[PDB]
Ligand binder design. Structure first.
Ligand SMILES: *NC[C@H](*)CC(=O)OC
Lengths: 145, 75
């Protein structure tokens, strides 16, 4: 029930949804996850050990994982980028939505339950991600049949 | 009462729950209907992401009120 980002020192302001802080034409309700406005500069956080999502995004956008991670550090607080979830289960699709807002694209995630969309529709770039239930969720580029 | 749940795949499920039912048990019934674990479930009622440790009556959700479902896919 308690939240770490409530008193996060790298963020200012109160708890607000991601769509209110950074509004775009996101897919319906895919941006309602709570967060806070980033306060302090990039703490130079290490590359997450579970970096499948970053590799999947890099294979599509040609952007190095380092720049994507730095942009995530500029958009999101540290308590939502590297925590107990990051080192055990891995990155979430909320980071994918943040990267889609920062780099202007609409990622198409081809999970085991069907295709989903994440990211602003008022864009041009369209990347494709394959999601595996696993366990756990594995992120790869492209699609499958 | 009876409510509806609009998923991220367009499918609108019809669910029957109690007015004092907790969000955790609602996610369990969604897991029953579809198969989505509560690990990847986030329910929204008009823009506000619901909290697991609350009930439907707290958010003033009447019968036949649709709830949106968003998948929080980890990995
Ligand atoms: N969910 C974190 C990424 C999975 C992974 O790295 O598999 C190789």
């Amino acid at each position: 029930l308690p939240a770490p980002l409530t008193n996060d020192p790298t963020a200012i302001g109160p708890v607000l949804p991601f769509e209110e802080l950074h509004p775009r034409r996101y897919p319906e309700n895919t941006a309602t996850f709570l967060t806070r406005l980033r306060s302090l500069p990039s703490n130079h956080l290490p590359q997450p050990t579970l970096n499948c999502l970053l590799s999947a995004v890099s294979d599509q956008t040609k952007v190095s994982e380092e720049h994507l991670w730095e942009s995530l550090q500029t958009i999101l607080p540290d308590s939502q980028l590297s925590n107990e979830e990051t080192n055990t289960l891995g990155l979430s699709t909320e980071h994918l939505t943040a990267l889609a807002h920062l780099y202007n694209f609409q990622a198409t995630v081809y999970s085991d339950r069907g295709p989903i969309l994440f990211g602003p529709s008022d864009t041009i770039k369209r990347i494709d991600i394959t999601h595996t239930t696993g366990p756990p969720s594995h992120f790869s580029p492209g699609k499958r049949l | 009462m009876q409510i509806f749940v609009k998923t991220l795949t367009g499918k609108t499920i019809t669910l029957e729950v109690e007015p004092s039912d907790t969000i955790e048990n609602v996610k369990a019934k969604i897991q029953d209907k579809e198969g989505i674990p509560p690990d990847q479930q986030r329910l929204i009622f008009a823009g506000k992401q619901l909290e697991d440790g609350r009930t439907l009556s707290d958010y003033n959700i009447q019968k036949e009120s649709t709830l949106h479902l968003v998948l929080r896919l980890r990995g």
